[PDB]
């Protein structure tokens, strides 16, 4: 480990995965006795307690080379399970802000960081564990939670202009748009970790008028992170 | 109009079971009720009949990515908006023995040709079944007791192409099995809107030796699979 | 050995004539002498018999480069090496009427998946037919007093795969037709040292409206070719 | 910007961008007066004075995609000027560890990054600016530091294996290796900035190793830091 | 045209074309009255009689990019046949020096001039005429010349290091290499030019050993040639 | 070499290089007592002395493929210092005609060249000598000749058709457009040579013409050449 400087025994071997270091801490007060593990590069990492089973809670950065470096470290630290809980946007109209979508697929542009990887240019099936997706299925429902299930594109430019992107992505099967869950995927399938995503929606791109207030998305965020913590621990 | 599929309109169902080969199209007809053959033409045997009080259509696909591609195009010009394979496959990892199942929740692919005529550029766009109705093929196969698997599988273009490191590459993928049309049902069905599965029989073990199984061992196996896809397409 | 086409060992000729459609496969070897079913499965039917004292097969393909990939490759495993496709095609240009024929000199093709698997690499290997059967074939045709054109096709994946372009972009590339097979039969041809042709049946005229013919008219022109490609194979 | 919170007038034109935040903080001490204008997901950005010029050093993360939009939020911010200070792996033997690299060209593999900003495959000369890269030259040589002039290998995967990783990319014509140049570069020639990038050698994956120490990085750091704010304000 | 300086009515409508000027000047003796039409940046063209039927012999250079160049302007110039005339390297051992190759189609590595011709990395059928290519057959067999009828492989980098070149070309149906046809080929196919291309046997790749003298492969070129003008005033 | 028949000893290992065989002719009248070493296939070779150092003016011809063979075989016959001087057409509306670009990179269309020689598809840096570059700086700069410094964009394909050929590759960063550079950088970055690139302005493609004379054209040349030998002997 080079970048995340935990020690023997620290990193927990189920780790709930966000790209703001922000959320990480915030989301630590949800675990019993929370303790920093790590803090190197702003990666924070806590480990802490939920319902009396030990879970970590780490920062990935935003980024595909980011999330991969994290995953990879994490788990030469024990880590093997991984649910990534971020923020996305919607690339369909009916979905609302503060609402989720549990993640069934990635669609990506290949290149970077798969060829280094894969070694050349196939499309490998970039998709979470089967099983782990269906228990957050049963946690959000069981929670009274609205999600959608389906495909998301992860993008590597979140400022590259595209005229014609909501369509392009949507018409091929992805309704949000983020940035790391490919690379989550598909590394994962590589390195046989058990992976898989739920995004709480921000932005609905399909709509750029609709807003959410700051407490009301906080509370999405804290509503949803409950359900994920009840699946890693479940 | 469709120029390969020539069953008129109103003779194909919104549910189809797609298979590759002719023959089995043939075979599993029976398990319909007053089953009546729609298509024959270039051999793209399709029939139509009931099952638990629904029309559903059991068609030929025939291999390959540019074939089915055609036979779901023309199904869905006739109607049809549910799909669900039902083939035969060769597994990639050792654990997995001849006769059981994989419900397949993802396929890998090489680039190129079909999905760069459809896609209008080489992004891989994830290629994956219906999220609703791969969980209902595996609660139809739980409750009939069947043995599956539930993973990615490589869909290849050219069985005979040789590579040395085939299987470990594959497998180490994440794939558990290699077939050569799951890429495309998925894919064309999320740019369609169609609603896509598929299930398949093991016929064969890539990664242990080349075990084998009776004729009627595997029949069976073909014959118990297909009712649980019937009940599933029709749940 | 094959798993697809189940003929024996001796019961497929070194010469053969394939075709995508099972049905022109029956009907074609109603030309040959003793014509023998050497083989149904998987609806792939190949008929052996006699003509011109030779002994000669017509063999299904499919349809698309993945199917008469494997067809090619297991019929050459049971002792082929001469393959001459006859298809049916759509022209590209105005000036060729319906019915009339297109001796192949070449195939365009997208790159990607079965040439990836085959060739290791996205190399552009040129893929065009032998050419002493090529000659031949054009010796034949003109022999039997038939309107042949002579050129390249474009060889797509995707049928209904939209391209609002399409027929400018293939026929300012130097394409005359469009069909599905060619260029998997020659490169892979090329590959395993089989000597591979191709004529084709015009059925369709992409750049002029939608002209048509009889169906008469159209089976005349199958059976008239079929002749001079079994000329051709026995010459 | 939705990453990088500044306000408008609190990041300056000419900008020091380092991936770890916790340098970021650490060579703010070389500013006068340095107030923290940004703290948001981590991205601290630190604005104050030097050499009589206004001058503000932002954390970008790690990989392209993170770069990209700290890159694009800064620049909307005001931001036109962008030096790169990092860590790089030199790739020939005779490169000593805490000497500095002053890149001149980056070579990567193609990918979506890319894709999505220049539109196709083609392989645009990713090149810092001429002007900026001689002042690097110039600052280095009259503080005495010991540098070397070539080009790098952006990697996006760090962890990928290449069991010929050194032999290709050395013969390739780069003599280290790092993650965000070839972004840095490319983006910048496509939105007109002015952008730069020195390295600081902390290992060498040519040579079995160097006996240095955590505080001999340190310093090698800190002069750096000075030579690149010289450059920045000259 | 901005490199073939030739007037209205210089250059002939059928053209045989060679890579280096010193054949296109030597082969000129072949022809009556022969003019220099053209010396503008080496291409040396020629324009006299041959069988009473006026012709023309350009030259090339080396590589497609050149190529493409020239033909482009002769066909300004009122060209539209095209024979061209070279050497070649053969990848099956059983074909020798001095010897010829009637070309039936190119292979060729995608990019470049390839793709900003055709547009996209489609692989277009890059054939000769089908008409003209017999009648080479045709004359060169009436001369009884030597010659073998197949595909070749249109390398553009001559010393490029590939150590599984010859079975890897040979495998692929190509019986030799040289480096103009795929383009000749192709621009001719989507421009609408009539073109084929002869090639001698220089050199033998799948044996190093043979050797041809000088004087016998200049009578080699010059009775090719003849074949060739034979075809091209048929 | 097969296409430079200079005898060894008769090359030098500083070379300028041109594509057009008639200014390689030109400019050899620069060098003191100037022995023409080469002919074949229309590469003028042209060695004698300047400013007290063994300098070499060698011919080109058009393309990366034909640059390529050429460099080679002066490598083989003891180059291995290289400065091209050729015409460009200038990408933005500032540069006048007679004017010079010094690049300082290239961006290019992925080929079969850089395929055979780099193996794969990744975008290696295609960038000049550093110090070779700077030292023309100098020599321009004391010679007091009006240039710029920029990216260049090496086609292959003069006469391919792109009704957006400026405006794309203006925003990529380039200034002006020509065919070898991008393999002569590429190659001297493998091969372990030294390179640079000066360029006269012919032609600007950004506006609608300037009015010039076919004469201040000729001086623009002879006064770039000697720059340039300047630089090759400092």
Same mark, same amino acid.
């Given at each position: 480990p080079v970048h995340i400087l935990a020690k023997k025994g620290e990193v927990a071997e189920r780790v709930l995965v966000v790209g703001d270091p922000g959320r990480a801490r915030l989301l #630590? @007060? !949800? !675990?019993?006795? /929370?303790? !920093? @593990?790590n803090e190197n590069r702003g990666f924070l990492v806590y480990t802490g307690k939920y319902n009396g089973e030990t879970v970590s809670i780490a920062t990935h950065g935003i980024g595909g080379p980011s999330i991969a470096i994290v995953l990879e470290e994490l788990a030469m630290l024990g880590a093997n399970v991984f649910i990534r809980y971020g923020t996305t946007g919607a690339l369909v109209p009916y979905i609302n802000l503060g609402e989720y979508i549990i993640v069934t697929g990635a669609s990506y542009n290949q290149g970077g960081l798969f060829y280094q990887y894969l070694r050349d240019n196939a499309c490998v099936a #970039? @998709? /979470?564990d089967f099983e782990l997706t269906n228990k957050l299925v049963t946690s959000f429902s069981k929670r009274n939670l609205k999600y959608y299930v389906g495909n998301v594109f992860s993008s590597d430019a979140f400022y590259a202009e595209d005229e014609e992107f909501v369509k392009k992505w949507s018409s091929r099967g992805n309704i949000a748009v983020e940035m790391e869950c490919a690379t989550l995927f598909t590394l994962s399938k590589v390195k046989g970790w058990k992976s898989a995503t739920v995004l709480v929606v921000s932005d609905n791109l399909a709509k750029g008028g609709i807003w959410i207030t700051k407490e009301e998305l906080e509370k999405s965020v804290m509503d949803g992170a409950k359900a994920v913590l009840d699946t890693l621990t479940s």
């Open positions: #630590s @007060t !949800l !675990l019993q006795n /929370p303790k !920093l @593990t #970039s @998709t /979470p």
